[PDB]
UniProtKB/Swiss-Prot annotation, chains A, B:
Functional summary from the UniProt entry: Required for thylakoid formation.
Family: Belongs to the PspA/Vipp/IM30 family.
Taxonomic placement: Bacteria, Bacillati, Cyanobacteriota, Cyanophyceae, Synechococcales
Residues spanning the signal sequence: none
Subcellular location: Cell inner membrane
Protein name: Membrane-associated protein Vipp1
Taxonomic source organism: Synechocystis sp. (strain ATCC 27184 / PCC 6803 / Kazusa)
Disulphide bridges, residue numbers: none
Disruption phenotype: Essential, it cannot be completely disrupted. Cells with very low levels of protein have no ordered thylakoids, are barely green and are non-photosynthetic.
Superkingdom field: Bacteria
Amino acid sequence: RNLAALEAKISEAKTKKNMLQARAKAAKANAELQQTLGGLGTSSATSA
Amino acid sequence: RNLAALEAKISEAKTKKNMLQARAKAAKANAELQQTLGGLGTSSATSA
């Protein structure tokens, strides 16, 4: 029974951590994309 | 008669001590297994 419980714990922890990390990476990538969209610097030609 | 008694004593002492040692070793192994089941350290990923 301890082995069954430990296997369940290991599987759930591994899969949940992996998916959480993947989703956090996707979210930060999306935030970076939004920043770049707002961070466009082509307006510097106003100096010329 | 002394030889018969001594042989009985020797046989019983040897077998009883051997079985007691084996069972104590099995019990300590089981306790170690339970400790390891309770001693899982995979939770340290909470830091990451």
